[PDB]
Amino acid sequence: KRQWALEDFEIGRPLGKGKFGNVYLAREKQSKFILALKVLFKAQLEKAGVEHQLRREVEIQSHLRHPNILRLYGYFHDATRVYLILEYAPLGTVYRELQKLSKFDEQRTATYITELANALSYCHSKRVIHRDIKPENLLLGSAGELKIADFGWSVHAPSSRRDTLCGTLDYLPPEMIEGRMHDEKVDLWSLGVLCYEFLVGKPPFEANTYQETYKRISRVEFTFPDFVTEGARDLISRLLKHNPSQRPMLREVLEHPWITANSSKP
Amino acid sequence: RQWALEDFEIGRPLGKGKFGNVYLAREKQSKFILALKVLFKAQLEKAGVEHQLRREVEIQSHLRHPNILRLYGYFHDATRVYLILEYAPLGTVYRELQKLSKFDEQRTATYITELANALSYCHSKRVIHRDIKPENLLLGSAGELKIADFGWSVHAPSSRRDTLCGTLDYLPPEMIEGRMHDEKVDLWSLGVLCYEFLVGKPPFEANTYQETYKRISRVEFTFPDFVTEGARDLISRLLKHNPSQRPMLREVLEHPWITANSSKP
Amino acid sequence: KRQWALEDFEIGRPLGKGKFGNVYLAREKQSKFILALKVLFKAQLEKAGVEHQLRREVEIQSHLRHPNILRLYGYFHDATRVYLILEYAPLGTVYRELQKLSKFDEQRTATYITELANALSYCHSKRVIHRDIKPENLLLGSAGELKIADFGWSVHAPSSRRDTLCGTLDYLPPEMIEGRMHDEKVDLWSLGVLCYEFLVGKPPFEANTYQETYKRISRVEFTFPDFVTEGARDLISRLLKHNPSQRPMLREVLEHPWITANSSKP
């Protein structure tokens, strides 16, 4: 419950250069507190009409508190730009980490799904569906812990909104790409897509064209490489079911044999 | 008594605090020289310190001690509030430290003495300052120390997590860990202060809030070679993680180094 | 492989005040490296004739490298004192933490015995027996990890040295107090005593007199409070066997059901 401005901050090196605007390392001058400064040029926001989406991000991501959900501290607008004041994630994104390791072992994967399942559970309990779970949106804290960020696309559940689908639809479920009514079960589908990608290096329905990925997700056409263990095959196949009602609850996922067998964090 | 702004002739800016600035002022009918702390209601209400300010006025106006900066009264304009404070002719101990870099053992010893007296009086009427730093220590006409800014002071013991907005260089472990704290907070601060006076910087200074949090938590501090053994003793006594193992203000006042170097009993 | 002196260091607050001399926080001036400075007054060392065991500590503790064994960096002697340059353990001793929590849960205990068993295994493989395993000699690293220190009483195994037994013989095994020949199995007895104390708050043979503790250790007379679980009772009873040859190996301890069931670190 405070008021900020740019002269309150000392800005450091670029952290990552998202679409909309870039992210910098920053320090609150009076407390020397290290955080990150997400800078968005008003022009590319208003012209692309995400001016409702940004406000949804700030509202939701600032009223949530969980160790596995990246904190948003406050916001402030310049004459030309907007500034989101975010928690700083020392170890960057899970996406870059996967670029570095190619694929994850069952223990890193298991733990990432566990931490991510906890953040999602807390999210659903306050009735929030993220809808945009992808490794570009998973940051890592100081101890290498997972932290969900970018709640721009999250809404209150259930929902029936066909938002202008601008991203690769790799992590979107059938119900969402078919513009239908979806609930919190979206994030379970995403969680499955994500477990598979962590273990294999690519998402299960990856393709060379939007339309073909649409066909693959629609018909749920995915195959495991030989090296995916039977336990991982179980959890993933459970999570990737066409009907949302046949997908497990986050508690069944947290209690799945494979998960507890390989996860280091309970 | 009741005051208003037309009762004063306002002079030069003395120091420009964050909420509002401080001016030199003169009560027109008596020609009495004091200071006028002007606070814009806007930056106060929106930052929600409207309880803290009232705490400052209550406490600092019912206290009397030569080493505690007097508050005379207050009055509110349609815009802003005005605190009528005692004038401190030699400015802050903070600017004095900026000018001299570091203090000698005699200036330090004496500042800790005067400050220990003000704190002792404060505890006896059950008051904990919690925000002891050199920006809040002013100097009287004879160079005497004068504690000011009781905004963050409360009655002891307490268990309030106040929105920690400032650098936590002078805060003790119990306070940064949002735990229950009593009057021993000011002893920790007093140690941090003795060190800074002698060295030029506080013992847990750092480049980030989180790192200073780590250093205060684990009490990680080291003396330069020039800090004498006596100062090392008093400071190490004062900087103990457990509040119950910190001395009382009387042990501090009676410490060997203190009496050996302090000019004011 | 370097030469040190006191003027190389900026000395900080007292960390703990041992009997021979005290321990201070210190910083290597040129590199700003944080460590600890153990200061021993030559007088109390020569007159108590521990001038061989000190040299044994420096030799052994400086040629050992293990994450769970506190590093000794070097040493240097003043005209009046000696200075051991040690690794700094941010979270103090396991002894003070036991004072703070009264007793440990099965998970903290299990993990402490695990880390401690790893350090001991490494120690035995280079044929080193500590002989003085007690919570006052277990320090905690930055992440809360256990770190064995104080190798003064450690010798090469096997051994048949009586040594002027000071201390208090709570953690000593029957063979050592009976001045007999002991091997590496001493540290297994100690490990058992330590597991019990972690779980209960006191060592199993604690008493009001040296002679009475001698009788209790000799006859292995110890009883569990009701709250000690069956699994812990098993591991402890195995470790506390009069004949060294009937005590498990560090691998059987590391693989014990209770241990893996409750330990967080493999």
Add this chain to the structure above:
Amino acid sequence: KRQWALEDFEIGRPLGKGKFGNVYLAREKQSKFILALKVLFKAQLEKAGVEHQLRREVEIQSHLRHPNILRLYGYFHDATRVYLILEYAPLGTVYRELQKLSKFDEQRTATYITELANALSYCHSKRVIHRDIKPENLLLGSAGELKIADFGWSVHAPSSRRDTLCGTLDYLPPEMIEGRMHDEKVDLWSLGVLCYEFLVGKPPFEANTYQETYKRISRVEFTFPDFVTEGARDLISRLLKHNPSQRPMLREVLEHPWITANSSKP
């Protein structure tokens, strides 16, 4: 290609006192040539080792010719001590001048980085990496020109040597402190750290402890004061990248907009 001895020189005032031994002003008796005499006591060299590094300094620094690289003329060993016969730098070190001015303007900085980038470019072309670029090792010639000295830590690139890391990791890059394989890109990182320090008065990762500075360099955590211009922020941020492959080449540095805009020497 000549033989020297101490009786060949008239020795003058102490110039600076650099740990291994001090530096004096000297004059070659027959030619009256003014130079400097670095005197090193064999004792503090052999016992600390570095008897390989010193020979590395003499080899490399004596076979290099560049206006911005401090010449080494020859060497000779006394029964006690060794004597390096070096070029004399009339205006002392960049380190003492930084102490005197607190911080540098964009013109002094730009030019120092230019001269330094030229010396480094020449160094890489004969495949030499300095690895120890710091203001204490930059001397100033008669006309205020920058002159790199102290090539003891310089090796041929690439390398994979964990040298006993002393001094201070203020100018070392992540790859070097993590004991990994490093190439010529070490000196680009150093160059960035150096530009920042010239402009700000302190290095970007300065800290109160070795371990904390290690964390900051590792995660590349640095912030600009308000007064650092956008151009300087660009060049510094380019130079301070965790991955060596993403750092510019010395030609991109020499051709950077900020540099040419403010550098007086082409």
